[PDB]
Design a protein around this ligand. Sequence first.
Ligand SMILES: CN[C@@H]1[C@H](O[C@H]2[C@H](O[C@H]3[C@H](O)[C@@H](O)[C@H](NC(=N)N)[C@@H](O)[C@@H]3NC(=N)N)O[C@@H](C)[C@]2(O)CO)O[C@@H](CO)[C@H](O)[C@H]1O
Ligand SMILES: Nc1ncnc2c1ncn2[C@@H]1O[C@H](COP(=O)(O)OP(=O)(O)OP(=O)(O)O)[C@@H](O)[C@H]1O
Ligand SMILES: [Ca+2]
Ligand SMILES: [Cl-]
Length: 267
Amino acid sequence: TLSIPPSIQCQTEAACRLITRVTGDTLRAIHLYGSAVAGGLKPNSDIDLLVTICQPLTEAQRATLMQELLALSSPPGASAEKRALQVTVVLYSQLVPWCFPPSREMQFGEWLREDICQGIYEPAQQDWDMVLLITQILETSIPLKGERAERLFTPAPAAQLLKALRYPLDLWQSTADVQGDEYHIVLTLARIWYTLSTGRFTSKDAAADWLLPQLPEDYAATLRAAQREYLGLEQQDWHILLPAVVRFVDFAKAHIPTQFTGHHHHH
Ligand SMILES: CN[C@@H]1[C@H](O[C@H]2[C@H](O[C@H]3[C@H](O)[C@@H](O)[C@H](NC(=N)N)[C@@H](O)[C@@H]3NC(=N)N)O[C@@H](C)[C@]2(O)CO)O[C@@H](CO)[C@H](O)[C@H]1O
Ligand SMILES: Nc1ncnc2c1ncn2[C@@H]1O[C@H](COP(=O)(O)OP(=O)(O)OP(=O)(O)O)[C@@H](O)[C@H]1O
Ligand SMILES: [Ca+2]
Ligand SMILES: [Cl-]
């Protein structure tokens, strides 16, 4: 261990074999990461995969990969036997040596099903979240193909990890920026706050529990509602809660650290 949860082994092997067959000789590695390995696998959770390749895929490779991942993935919650897949593809040359912000070659996920069905695919593009993804994989991941992460990737400088953690925080500003993703944003803000304060990464649920006793009660109530929905215990009316979510976002913007809290950098 680390270990692949038995309940996802079959689908994870099928995804691995598809990605291997389509990418052929450009494939460098495939890593399983996220809550399946780090903890907190819930009924709606996806299976998170990072695919490292040497050269860009042809349009043929990309089209085949997208269409066949549609058949291997299901919408979150539709099935207990066939989960949503999230597959991010990255060029090795964006990570070794690092390019900041790094780009991602391709992204599959269920939120893109309607577009992907019609052959509409996001182009390669810069994404600061890749710094966070590789940082998490260096701590907790399983190589399904290729080498263990610590033999393949190198840590980003703290200065760049700081920028990657604060980029989404600065970008959430208006009601429309958060509508449709209320509990997800509230919980991700708790995770960002936890990482900047401790230098560590933790699950959505554990980050909420870490932050709750530190908040004034009004902000603790919004965080509790987000946590309780994520845990399956009650679905809120987020239209009614939107003004309090906006206040929570602004409180986090005002209070989250602007540099790692040092002896508490990520190591
Ligand atoms: C890349 N992961 C997906 C992606 O996650 C994003 C998410 O991104 C959403 C933004 O938070 C949200 O503000 C934005 N809304 C507006 N621009 N109005 C959403 O569009 C954005 N979602 C998205 N781009 N799919 O929040 C980031 C912290 C993320 O987890 C990084 O991985 O989108 C989520 C749906 O929104 C999916 O559940 C995730 O699987
Ligand atoms: N400090 C942080 N700690 C962890 N993830 C963070 C942090 N800041 C931003 N994120 C980003 O939030 C996303 C978390 O991915 P995802 O929603 O799949 O979560 P998960 O932990 O696997 O839980 P789930 O079981 O709900 O899928 C990633 O894009 C990750 O890089
Ligand atoms: Ca996940
Ligand atoms: Cl778990």
